[PDB]
């Protein structure tokens, strides 16, 4: 994979050398890899709007956290590469966390606020085409596996799917404050320095205008891979002027969803190994 992407790196981009190049992460259809020890180039056989988002928040936040700057790119419909500048740092995990002081905490929960309250407050004109309607999208979602599998679906599943869409329907979290956002605001984008404050961000391939709430999703996430539900309350006070209990419910509603997108994903790639995966996460969710 490496030779073929040092290929192509140097294909694409005239006058660049590869003096090396490892593979520093991948996802089900990217890789992303470190050139030069110096240069992330993310890959995938989309990257127009990532790049559009890097190029508009790079001209309009005023912040030093580091996000990243494009220099090189190259978009087809067949191939997708976007290379910039490695943002330097360590990664926040629950390990790290549990190992700073109350007051370093304290100090990288107002960097984070900080910095969701200066991009959800930016004029989003420039980037306007970049809007996302999250409860559209389920529904156009549900309208395929209504043409597709849903009639071979059990009841357990078919129930647990009728039970989503009723709550859907009755909830209002869809209806707040619309703004830019992250729209993956994990804990393993969010990069330190060697104070254990935040540095930097990156992967801001999902961003979009969409809800506001949808930035304290993993913020606000009871699992091995975030900080937890205590954290993303901190956060959200310090953020200020937002429903903390609607955030919530906005969090709580995605988390339901996740089987059902990830059978979604399942059939629009034809990839049943997915299907079969949210089916069966349907039964363990059901069974607590
Ligand atoms: N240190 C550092 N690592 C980076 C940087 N950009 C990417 N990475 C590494 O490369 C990985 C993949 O980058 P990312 O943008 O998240 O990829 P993706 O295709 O959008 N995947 P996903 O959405 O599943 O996170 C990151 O998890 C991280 O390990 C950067 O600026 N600095
Ligand atoms: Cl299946
Ligand atoms: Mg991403």
Redesign the pocket.
Known sequence: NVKAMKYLIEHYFDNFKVDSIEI????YD?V?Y?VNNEY?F?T?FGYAKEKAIYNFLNTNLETNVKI?NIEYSYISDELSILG??????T?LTPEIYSTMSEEEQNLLKRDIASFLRQMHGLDYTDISECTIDNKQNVLEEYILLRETIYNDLTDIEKDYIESFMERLNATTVFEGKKCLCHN?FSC??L?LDGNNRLT?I??F??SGIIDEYCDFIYLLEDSEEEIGTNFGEDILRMYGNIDIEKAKEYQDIVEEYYPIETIVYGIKNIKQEFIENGRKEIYKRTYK
């Open positions: 520093i992460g991948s996802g990217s992303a470190l992330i993310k995938k990243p910039y500048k490695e943002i330097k740092g990664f993956d393993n984008h990069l930097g990156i992967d391939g999902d």
